[PDB]
Design a binder for these strands. Structure first.
Lengths: 99, 99
DNA sequence: TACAGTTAGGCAA
DNA sequence: ATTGCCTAACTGTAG
DNA sequence: TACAGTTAGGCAT
DNA sequence: ATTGCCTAACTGTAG
């Protein structure tokens, strides 16, 4: 229905859009980490294209793409985005305005 | 032989000491993330006790415990610790001296 | 070093 | 099995 | 805003 | 399927 492949070489992981809280960059070259309800998945991708898939995926920071549908709350004073699963990331200066 | 349980509630994950590159803190309360060769595992634990399990686990930062056995290289000028799997973390001011 | 700012994990739910 | 509020202990930076 | 420092992802392997 | 080197675009901070 709303599926995405997270490409991983020797397999792929497939997930639904709204299974994902957010994505962030890994320390491994050209890898991201998809944050799901209570698993994190290492995979090959670019933040840019993922934010261009759907309006709910908002590139809130150079290093983070958040799913609007899974925001639990937002401290826009500290610029922390809270998710349903109690993870959080940060919205940059430039992007917090437009969430 | 050298096994550790990563307690996760509705299951546990068990791993060998040297399967683990390093541990870091999650954004989820009282959870850590174990970094294995190419998976990251969310679990309930404290950095302190893990560094006390074995000398190879060195608490190199408030937020990181590294496995000495899986260090690939160390930039002690930038204070970045590189691991066999091409992840890296940072050694704090206080701890980089003693690795 | 000592200082203004951040956080791991205790305590309660 | 999970979640927040708190503070003792850490963190990076300048003098 | 404009500035000194950091990084996502292109290009090569 | 993986890894490093590079730079255009981001990042936080002070004036």
């Amino acid at each position: 229905v709303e599926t995405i492949e997270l490409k991983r070489g020797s397999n792929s992981v497939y997930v639904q859009y709204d299974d994902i809280m957010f994505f962030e960059s890994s320390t491994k070259s050209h890898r991201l980490i998809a944050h799901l309800d209570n698993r994190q998945i290492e995979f090959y991708g670019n933040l840019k294209e993922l934010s261009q898939l759907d309006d709910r995926f908002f590139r809130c920071h150079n290093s983070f793409v958040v799913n609007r549908h899974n925001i639990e709350s937002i401290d826009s004073k500290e610029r922390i985005v809270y998710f349903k699963n109690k993870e959080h990331c940060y919205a940059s200066v430039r992007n917090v305005k437009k969430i």
